[PDB]
Design a protein around this nucleic acid. Structure first.
Ligand SMILES: [Mg+2]
Ligand SMILES: [Mg+2]
Ligand SMILES: [Mg+2]
Ligand SMILES: [Mg+2]
Ligand SMILES: [Mg+2]
Ligand SMILES: [Mg+2]
Ligand SMILES: [Mg+2]
Ligand SMILES: [Mg+2]
Ligand SMILES: [Mg+2]
Ligand SMILES: [Mg+2]
Ligand SMILES: [Mg+2]
Ligand SMILES: [Mg+2]
Ligand SMILES: [Mg+2]
Ligand SMILES: [Mg+2]
Ligand SMILES: [Mg+2]
Ligand SMILES: [Mg+2]
Ligand SMILES: [Mg+2]
Ligand SMILES: [Mg+2]
Ligand code: NA
Ligand code: NA
Ligand code: NA
Lengths: 197, 66, 49
RNA sequence: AAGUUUGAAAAGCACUUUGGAAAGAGAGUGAAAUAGAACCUGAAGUCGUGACAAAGACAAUGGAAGUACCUCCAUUUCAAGAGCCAGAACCAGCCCUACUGCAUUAUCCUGUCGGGGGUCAAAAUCCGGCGGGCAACGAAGUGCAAGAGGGUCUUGGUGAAAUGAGCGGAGUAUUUGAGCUGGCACGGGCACGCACUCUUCUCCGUGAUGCUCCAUGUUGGCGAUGGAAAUGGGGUGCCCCCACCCGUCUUGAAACACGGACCAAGGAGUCAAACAGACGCGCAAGGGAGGAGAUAUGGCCAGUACUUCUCUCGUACUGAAAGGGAGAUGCAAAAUGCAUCUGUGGUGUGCACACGUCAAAUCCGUUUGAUUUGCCCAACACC
RNA sequence: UCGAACCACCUAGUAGCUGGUUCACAUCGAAGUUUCCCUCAGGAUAGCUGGUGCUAGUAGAAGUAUUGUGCGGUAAAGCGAUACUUUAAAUGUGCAAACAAACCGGCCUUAGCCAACUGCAAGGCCGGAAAGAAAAGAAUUAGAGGCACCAAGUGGGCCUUCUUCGGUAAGCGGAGCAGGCGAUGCGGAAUGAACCGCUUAGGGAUAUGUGGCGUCAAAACUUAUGGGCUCAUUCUCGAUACGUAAAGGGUGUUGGUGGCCACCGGCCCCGAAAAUGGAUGACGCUUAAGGCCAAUUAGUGAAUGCCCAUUAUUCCUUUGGUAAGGGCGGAAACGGAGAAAGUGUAGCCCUUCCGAUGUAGAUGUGGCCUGGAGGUUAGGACGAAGCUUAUGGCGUGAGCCUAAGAUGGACCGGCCUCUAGUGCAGAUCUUGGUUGGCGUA
RNA sequence: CGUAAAAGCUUGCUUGAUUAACGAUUUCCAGUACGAAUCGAGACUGCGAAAGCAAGGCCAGCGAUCCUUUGCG
């Protein structure tokens, strides 16, 4: 035999195929698997990898965030070049906290109705990945973006709330119930707010 | 009835290895340090942030010029 | 063992084989051993003086 | 407990013959009597009978590999045929046995002189002087070694692209060693390190407009349509070898540890409600009811289609409570300051894209990696 | 029916305790230990395990060395008593060894230190250098770092090596370090959970390990052109470790030291006494088939006498990957056919490399099977379901399909979705029927 | 264990055995609490000419929820 102690611990868990039932998602996966295999661009490979992820791992993005990052990229651009196309593998939602935006071209899997209205009324354009593959088949002059995951209630609940240094929320339906011994100094003790490392 | 031994414990501890310590440059908080030096360092950092904002504005203006 | 594989990996092996057959030739061995013994004993006798 | 479920219809077995009778043997009805009255189908287990196979005591059962006999099974071949079974040849590969030199010998080999030894006398074993040296046909059993005949029922094939020192074309030379030859190194001269005659065969060639699979020799035996031949499967016996009784608790079961006669049918993670994570689907700063109504609508129709204004979860938290309640930049220092509003509060690490460089390969126009600078998405760390 | 009658009901009372728990293959794979508990036949908690991933694929790596630099009071040594201690190992153990780091010079800021700052402390900005770590034995890697979420089983252990504490001792109790069995076969030690060798997809060939080569029993058909030693009469010479006899004697025989003596060896013999008949495994063996040493066909002249594994090398086939490459615009014409942009199939097709055992436990499967619903597509009086089998064929398997009935007489198969009172060998299981004992008592 | 112009003895003055903005840490350890302990920032002080030293007697000497009771604004 061969001494291979603990070699199964080096294998990694990765997804090869989609669990989605959407035929249009399947068509997009077919196109971008072809492109990622037959082209050298890194854009196509990243896009193909992201199309296979689960819904929870494709977080939605905000129109205001798109505008802010595009402006920060634009202030250092030669002003003789066109602005890049914003590309998000996910959903784009509208933001009522920001009224005035510039005109941009955004490619996405799905748009909110109000977000599509805002982009078009600002003079911009909404795009599908099938049009993007015709316009920029290697991903030249693009800005690939991701949405935010921290901030979710499920993430804010992770871990034990009773150990020192932790600020996770407990699972409780009655907000006034767990507010006593263990959380106040006047009771037996209080869970410490800070711990080094 | 009350048995004690350490017989299999090192073998258990080495399956997922003894992990090394976190590098010195991460989680380098100053909370609990000697107070006067901390108070001075905070003022220096505030001035440094102001300087960083001014430098970015100057760079943007220079690029716009040329 | 293989003739084709060996020659493919080392194109020079035929010359080595030629030298080997030459050194295994009987007359060459006899002359070489006889002459070599004279060359050594004579040189040792001269150098020790 | 117990379906009366014979059959379409009682057409529910006249008559003869044996028997005390029950019944039997014939005859008859019916499509059917192996549908004959508790009568559709009619399993398993157990038992009778006929034929056959064997077989000591080796408990029986079981595994593997053959053979004898059988086979209501399958499939393939019968004439120019490659089907089945043999034998030999050749090619590729692999595996075995063939064919072999260089260094080192000195505590050694050899001749004399003297000693010492011993014999019936002289030789040798042994020691010390100095003269030579190779124990050199298998001399060392010392160190390191390079040099086509036999198998493939251990593989694939018979040239349907044979890449070969091995198949082809062209000549006779090429250059490997061994001897012997003319600055620096090596030692106190060079045993022949570094640089500039013998001994062997050399150079050239077949891309895939073939992505994949399968189809190609020679000589006999058997098979000419049958109660055929052959291969495979199935059955039973035999021989050699191997082989403790299942389930369970237990550190430990073949156990003198518990349950275990046979068969049929039944027999054990379910439904509801609250919460959470992962995955699928719709919409998104919003999402969604429920109850109820309205009209298509008055077996289809307990479904499907439509609906307000409400309710609920969320967009804001914090304090025991009275209560209060979150942008950025610049000026400034007001215990409710002032001005602008295309905007990441800052710093470190950090996809893709853009701008240049470097290295590697390439009908060579481009790839594959590394790296500088800009902006850095997600995210983490410190403020 | 009485140390509290009988009948029905609450009641399927509760049980940390005993018994049971129904198909296949594939990828992985434990623990008997920590802390708390009216806690010791139970839990919760961490660890060990599976699944799911996230992230910029060589990164912040290591049960191992080297070099530099720290820690230590055990073994040994010595002298309180008549083991405490100056000294002090081996085996250990902490840190470092150039890419968010460190070195060399501008400058900004601080309501930090100092009598003061052109010094010191801290945070930054602008520049330089960079054998990217030489030479001196001057590392190596079947060397991709980090970060989460959800959850199972387990919480009775036992054996051995080297240390040991209690005990007269124990197949006894308690501990330290490591390896095992439990959860595991296979090849050896005649036999044995734990010893020796080796660790496992389905098969060939070659060669080995431990152990062997008189027969049983493969191998020296009792090898050698090797040397010594040994004779043993009712359990008896002896002869495979782990594993089940002492003092003292002996002219039995073989040798060694010092002076025919005294002492020390090697084999053998007394010392050596139990309960069914019996054990180098049996027979037997003595120019051994015993015990110590040494060979490989033998002073000839040159690396391997022989035999046996689920190991090693190699060849064929399967299956799965943290897998690695290539082809897929029908070239044209007319030996055969095919050629799907693809998780999973009768796998879209080729080529290549590596792994494959496993209790409790996790997960996967265009994985198998049963009753009913929505669709679709078929069959049946020229014979549906059910039943029978030396009926073959297919599949690793759960199973599927055909044949024959000298069986039956009216219903029913495939495929995609939906749904559940959905798979039995065992529970002193339930109900029905059989059965040996038995033509016996 | 440690300590010699002391950490022992005598003596003078004292109350740091107070308060200490929910600072950080060690031991047990699940890296929870309790008990004990270490390094601190602020107030008010003691002793000393000064630098300094001192928030008990180094290291064992102690205790949740609910209820009772006192202080504080
Ligand atoms: Mg019947
Ligand atoms: Mg058992
Ligand atoms: Mg909220
Ligand atoms: Mg009575
Ligand atoms: Mg019950
Ligand atoms: Mg009961
Ligand atoms: Mg049980
Ligand atoms: Mg495994
Ligand atoms: Mg029990
Ligand atoms: Mg067990
Ligand atoms: Mg074993
Ligand atoms: Mg034999
Ligand atoms: Mg494969
Ligand atoms: Mg397995
Ligand atoms: Mg059931
Ligand atoms: Mg049954
Ligand atoms: Mg103070
Ligand atoms: Mg009270
Ligand atoms: Na938020
Ligand atoms: Na024996
Ligand atoms: Na049912």
């Amino acid at each position: 035999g061969v001494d291979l102690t603990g070699i199964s611990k080096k294998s990694r868990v990765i997804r090869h195929h989609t669990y989605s039932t959407n035929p249009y998602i399947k068509l997009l996966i077919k196109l971008y698997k072809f492109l990622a295999k037959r082209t050298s661009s890194g854009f196509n490979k990243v896009v193909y990898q992201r199309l296979i992820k689960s819904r929870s791992n494709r977080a939605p993005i905000s129109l205001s965030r798109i505008a802010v990052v595009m402006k920060r990229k634009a202030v250092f651009t030669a002003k003789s070049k066109a602005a890049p196309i914003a590309v998000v593998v996910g959903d784009v939602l509208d933001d009522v906290r920001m009224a005035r935006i510039p005109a941009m071209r955004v490619c996405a899997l799905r748009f909110s109705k109000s977000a599509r209205q805002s982009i078009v009324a600002a003079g911009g354009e909404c795009l599908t990945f099938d049009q993007l593959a015709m316009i920029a088949p290697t991903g030249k002059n693009t800005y690939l973006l991701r949405g935010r995951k921290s901030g979710r209630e499920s993430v804010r609940h992770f871990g034990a709330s009773g150990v020192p240094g932790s600020h996770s929320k407990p699972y409780a339906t009655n907000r006034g119930k767990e507010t006593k011994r263990g959380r106040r100094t006047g009771r037996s003790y209080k869970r410490k707010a800070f711990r080094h490392v | 009835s009350k048995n004690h031994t350490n017989h299999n414990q090192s073998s258990k501890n080495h399956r997922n290895g003894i992990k090394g310590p976190v590098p010195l440059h991460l989680h380098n908080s100053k909370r609990g340090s000697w107070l006067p030096a901390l108070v001075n360092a905070r003022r220096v950092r505030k001035h440094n942030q102001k300087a960083a904002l001014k430098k970015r504005r100057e760079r943007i203006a220079a690029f716009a010029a040329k | 063992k293989n003739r084709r594989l060996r020659l493919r990996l080392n194109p020079y092996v035929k010359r080595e084989t030629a030298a080997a057959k030459g050194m295994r030739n009987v007359a060459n061995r006899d002359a070489r051993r006889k002459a070599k013994l004279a060359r050594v004993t004579k040189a040792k006798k001269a150098a020790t003086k």
